[PDB]
Design an enzyme around this catalytic site. Structure first.
Site, mmCIF file in Angstrom:
data_model
loop_
_atom_site.group_PDB
_atom_site.id
_atom_site.type_symbol
_atom_site.label_atom_id
_atom_site.label_comp_id
_atom_site.label_asym_id
_atom_site.label_seq_id
_atom_site.Cartn_x
_atom_site.Cartn_y
_atom_site.Cartn_z
ATOM 1 C CG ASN A 114 -2.048 -6.232 -1.051
ATOM 2 O OD1 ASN A 114 -2.527 -5.685 -0.073
ATOM 3 N ND2 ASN A 114 -2.576 -6.126 -2.262
ATOM 4 C CG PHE A 118 -7.404 -0.402 5.070
ATOM 5 C CD1 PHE A 118 -7.111 -0.222 3.729
ATOM 6 C CD2 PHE A 118 -8.775 -0.430 5.449
ATOM 7 C CE1 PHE A 118 -8.106 -0.175 2.766
ATOM 8 C CE2 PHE A 118 -9.806 -0.305 4.483
ATOM 9 C CZ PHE A 118 -9.439 -0.262 3.116
ATOM 10 C CB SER A 184 -9.713 -3.383 1.118
ATOM 11 O OG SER A 184 -8.605 -4.182 1.513
ATOM 12 C CG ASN A 186 -6.222 -7.766 2.014
ATOM 13 O OD1 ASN A 186 -6.422 -8.985 1.897
ATOM 14 N ND2 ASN A 186 -5.534 -7.048 1.114
ATOM 15 C CB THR A 187 -10.794 -4.300 5.835
ATOM 16 O OG1 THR A 187 -9.488 -3.800 6.083
ATOM 17 C CG2 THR A 187 -11.713 -3.760 6.958
ATOM 18 C CE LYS A 224 -8.823 0.612 -6.146
ATOM 19 N NZ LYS A 224 -7.444 1.101 -5.913
ATOM 20 C CG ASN A 253 -9.150 -2.835 -4.306
ATOM 21 O OD1 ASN A 253 -7.998 -3.311 -4.126
ATOM 22 N ND2 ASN A 253 -9.700 -1.968 -3.464
HETATM 23 C C1 LIG Z 1 0.711 -3.745 -2.150
HETATM 24 C C2 LIG Z 1 -0.622 -3.165 -2.564
HETATM 25 C C3 LIG Z 1 -1.300 -2.344 -1.694
HETATM 26 C C4 LIG Z 1 -2.515 -1.796 -2.091
HETATM 27 N N1 LIG Z 1 -3.217 -0.966 -1.249
HETATM 28 C C5 LIG Z 1 -4.320 -0.368 -1.688
HETATM 29 C C6 LIG Z 1 -5.068 0.589 -0.845
HETATM 30 O O1 LIG Z 1 -4.622 0.898 0.292
HETATM 31 N N2 LIG Z 1 -6.225 1.071 -1.309
HETATM 32 C C7 LIG Z 1 -6.729 0.784 -2.547
HETATM 33 O O2 LIG Z 1 -7.829 1.295 -2.947
HETATM 34 N N3 LIG Z 1 -6.125 -0.070 -3.385
HETATM 35 C C8 LIG Z 1 -4.938 -0.637 -3.007
HETATM 36 N N4 LIG Z 1 -4.277 -1.494 -3.880
HETATM 37 C C9 LIG Z 1 -4.892 -1.749 -5.166
HETATM 38 C C10 LIG Z 1 -4.345 -0.973 -6.321
HETATM 39 O O3 LIG Z 1 -4.724 0.382 -6.096
HETATM 40 C C11 LIG Z 1 -4.978 -1.469 -7.615
HETATM 41 O O4 LIG Z 1 -6.402 -1.308 -7.497
HETATM 42 C C12 LIG Z 1 -4.691 -2.959 -7.914
HETATM 43 O O5 LIG Z 1 -3.422 -3.322 -7.423
HETATM 44 C C13 LIG Z 1 -4.737 -3.251 -9.410
HETATM 45 O O6 LIG Z 1 -3.801 -2.475 -10.154
HETATM 46 P P1 LIG Z 1 -2.371 -3.150 -10.566
HETATM 47 O O7 LIG Z 1 -2.658 -4.483 -11.222
HETATM 48 O O8 LIG Z 1 -1.803 -2.185 -11.553
HETATM 49 O O9 LIG Z 1 -1.440 -3.220 -9.335
HETATM 50 C C14 LIG Z 1 -3.034 -2.063 -3.457
HETATM 51 C C15 LIG Z 1 -2.324 -2.862 -4.323
HETATM 52 C C16 LIG Z 1 -1.145 -3.413 -3.937
HETATM 53 C C17 LIG Z 1 -0.435 -4.275 -4.949
HETATM 54 O O1 LIG Z 2 -4.407 -4.623 2.381
HETATM 55 C C1 LIG Z 2 -4.559 -3.477 1.919
HETATM 56 O O2 LIG Z 2 -4.311 -2.479 2.619
HETATM 57 C C2 LIG Z 2 -5.230 -3.353 0.588
HETATM 58 C C3 LIG Z 2 -4.896 -4.223 -0.399
HETATM 59 C C4 LIG Z 2 -5.569 -4.186 -1.559
HETATM 60 O O3 LIG Z 2 -5.231 -4.974 -2.502
HETATM 61 N N1 LIG Z 2 -6.562 -3.290 -1.740
HETATM 62 C C5 LIG Z 2 -6.951 -2.428 -0.813
HETATM 63 O O4 LIG Z 2 -7.904 -1.635 -1.037
HETATM 64 N N2 LIG Z 2 -6.254 -2.462 0.413
#
Ligand SMILES: Cc1cc2nc3c(=O)[nH]c(=O)nc-3n(C[C@H](O)[C@H](O)[C@H](O)COP(=O)(O)O)c2cc1C
Ligand SMILES: O=C(O)c1cc(=O)[nH]c(=O)[nH]1
Ligand SMILES: O=C1N=C(Nc2ccc(F)cc2C(=O)O)S/C1=C\c1cccc2ccccc12
Length: 365
Positions: A114, A118, A184, A186-187, A224, A253
């Site tokens: 992804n 944000f 993140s 992506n920022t 995080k 993350n």
């Molecule tokens: C589509 C998507 C959006 C995410 N957005 C955020 C986010 O806004 N903030 C954040 O701290 N982590 C975000 N994550 C990270 C998840 O919180 C997690 O740290 C990461 O996906 C690993 O766990 P997983 O393998 O179980 O998905 C996102 C993950 C995915 C897949």
């Molecule tokens: O693009 C996001 O918003 C996003 C993705 C991701 O994997 N982790 C995160 O902290 N933000």
């Protein structure tokens, strides 16, 4: 169970065939927010209970940030069986995030990539939404079902620390714990807030804003982190975390690495990778952070958890709690009771009286 089997073999493949991953996510958030799910078969045993971060957690399995970015499905997530819910990331102002498509399924790897960037309704909107259910949450929390809030920063923001401080002031009073998301991928520039001098300045300011909240409205503060840190980065984080008394770490993350072996056609899409290929990288980051903090800083372990074994490996490595996000995307809601059930069976098999006894057990071997 047949529910788990029906989702895994029938419903989820059908849903993936019909909807692009962003649409499916939106639809899932909508269904969940309406309570349109079974309701928990699985009844949490006392072995799964964990006390950490100034709270009781009825089970140690949480929904990771990013699923419910804007705080719309919290109650339906507890109904799905999660022992705690983290919403966000939330930015101070509303913002759209990146252009679509910005989410990609790597089915052959049980992974997602992804680059949402944000996308956020912003603090005010999320504040009013949590305020409308604030006392319902206070009872959920008292009952062992806490709420976390994950804070991010606006794309065009000219002072990162002030974005996080605003987050603390606005949502801190509604949260059992806050997360300073400095990881993140992506920022632009964000992950460099994990370096020593930036991190110390940033967290000093965050903790000061937190400490000026009224006692009953004062959350734990967690940082995080990424799976992609150098050894130096990690040592520095651990040192800062100890010098400032940060309450905990969320590890990890998504990764900007592309481990060798990925098969999905979309594997070279820009973004953070989640799911199975992240799993051990995350477990090892947990192991290292727990050793560097001498086991005294609570860790929420996340990345590639889709089974009780996955969860227990992170617990034994030093996580007091775990989260999942990508597994829900492949297996649906039944994966939640599945993880809890297997975890409890493994804890019994390995001789643990409960989750608490397993925490960091690999470091005492
Ligand atoms: C589509 C998507 C959006 C995410 N957005 C955020 C986010 O806004 N903030 C954040 O701290 N982590 C975000 N994550 C990270 C998840 O919180 C997690 O740290 C990461 O996906 C690993 O766990 P997983 O393998 O179980 O998905 C996102 C993950 C995915 C897949
Ligand atoms: O693009 C996001 O918003 C996003 C993705 C991701 O994997 N982790 C995160 O902290 N933000
Ligand atoms: O098929 C699904 N796909 C989901 N998400 C996604 C699927 C692919 C992707 F690249 C990303 C996501 C994401 O959330 O970023 S969630 C889901 C099913 C359900 C998940 C949770 C609650 C539900 C409730 C009712 C019906 C389905 C679901």
């Amino acid at each position: 169970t047949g529910d788990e089997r029906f989702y895994a073999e029938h419903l989820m493949p059908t849903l993936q065939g019909l909807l692009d991953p962003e649409s499916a996510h939106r639809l899932a958030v909508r269904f969940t927010s309406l309570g349109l799910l079974p309701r928990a078969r699985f009844q949490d045993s006392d072995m799964l209970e964990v006390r950490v971060l100034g709270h009781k957690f009825r089970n140690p399995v949480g929904i990771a940030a990013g699923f419910d970015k804007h705080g719309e499905a919290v109650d339906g997530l507890y109904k799905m069986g999660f022992g705690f819910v983290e919403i966000g990331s939330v930015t101070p102002k509303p913002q759209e995030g990146n252009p679509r498509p910005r989410v990609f399924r790597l089915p052959e790897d049980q992974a997602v990539i992804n680059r949402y960037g944000f996308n956020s309704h912003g603090l005010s909107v999320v504040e009013h939404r949590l305020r409308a259910r604030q006392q319902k949450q206070a009872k959920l929390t008292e009952d062992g079902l806490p709420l976390g809030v994950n804070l991010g920063k606006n794309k065009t923001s000219v002072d990162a620390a002030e974005d996080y401080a605003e987050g603390v002031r606005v949502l801190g009073p509604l949260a059992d714990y806050l997360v300073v998301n400095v990881s993140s991928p992506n920022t632009a520039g964000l992950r460099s807030l994990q370096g020593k001098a930036e991190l110390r300045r940033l967290l000093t300011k965050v903790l000061q804003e937190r400490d000026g909240l009224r006692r009953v409205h004062r959350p734990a503060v967690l940082v995080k982190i990424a799976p992609d840190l150098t050894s130096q980065d990690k040592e520095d984080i651990a040192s800062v975390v100890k010098e400032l008394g940060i309450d905990g770490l969320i590890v990890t993350n998504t990764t900007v690495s592309r481990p060798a072996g990925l098969q999905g056609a979309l594997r070279s899409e820009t973004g953070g990778l989640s799911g199975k290929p992240l799993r051990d990288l995350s477990t090892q980051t947990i192991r290292e952070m727990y050793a560097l903090t001498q086991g005294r800083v609570p860790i929420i372990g996340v990345g590639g958890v889709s089974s009780g074994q996955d969860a227990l490996e992170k617990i034994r490595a030093g996580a007091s709690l775990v989260q999942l996000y990508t597994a829900l995307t492949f297996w649906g809601p039944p994966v939640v009771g599945k993880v809890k059930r297997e975890l409890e069976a493994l804890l019994k098999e390995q001789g643990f009286g409960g989750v608490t006894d397993a925490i960091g057990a690999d470091h005492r071997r």
